[PDB]
Amino acid sequence: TEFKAGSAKKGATLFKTRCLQCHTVEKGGPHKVGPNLHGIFGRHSGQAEGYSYTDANIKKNVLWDENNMSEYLTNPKKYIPGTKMAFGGMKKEKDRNDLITYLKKATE
Ligand code: HEC
Numbered sequence: 845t846e847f848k849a850g851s852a853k854k855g856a857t858l859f860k861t862r863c864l865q866c867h868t869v870e871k872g873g874p875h876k877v878g879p880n881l882h883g884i885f886g887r888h889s890g891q892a893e894g895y896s897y898t899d900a901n902i903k904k905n906v907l908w909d910e911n912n913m914s915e916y917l918t919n920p921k922k923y924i925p926g927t928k929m930a931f932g933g934m935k936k937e938k939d940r941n942d943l944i945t946y947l948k949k950a951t952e
Pocket residue numbers: 859862863864865866867877878879884888889890891892896897898900901917926927928929930931934
């Protein structure tokens with residue numbers, strides 16, 4: 845309801861510049877500092893196997909959807925206190941609409 849589709853292309857580049865240092869999105873891509881994100885939409889938090897999540901992420905048990913994700917990306921630490929995801933956040937909803945739009949396509 846509060847997530848509007850943006851530019852997948854724009855979102856692709858946001859990812860490269862803000863998420864690529866610690867994550868992969870491809871099916872068969874490895875975990876790095878952060879878990880590979882393929883198929884994240886529809887799954888709950890802390891369920892990628894072979895990855896050592898914090899107690900926080902796990903217990904938060906977030907069901908990932910375009911909407912939740914938006915709030916998460918605004919300020920991960922405020923959303924999941926104790927998370928070791930060291931990203932400050934994405935304040936512009938347009939920047940977030942663009943990235944989730946990319947994510948929504950590339951992690952499927
Ligand atoms: C390293 C400096 C990171 C950057 C940059 C980004 N993320 Fe990340 N993320 C990182 C870690 C170590 C973890 C695991 C957290 C824990 O507490 O165990 C995460 C987690 C996520 C999640 C949750 C995944 C789950 O399976 O529940 C998501 C949805 C996620 N990361 C997405 C993501 C995006 C889109 C980013 C770019 C804007 C990004 N993160 C940055 C480490 C790092």
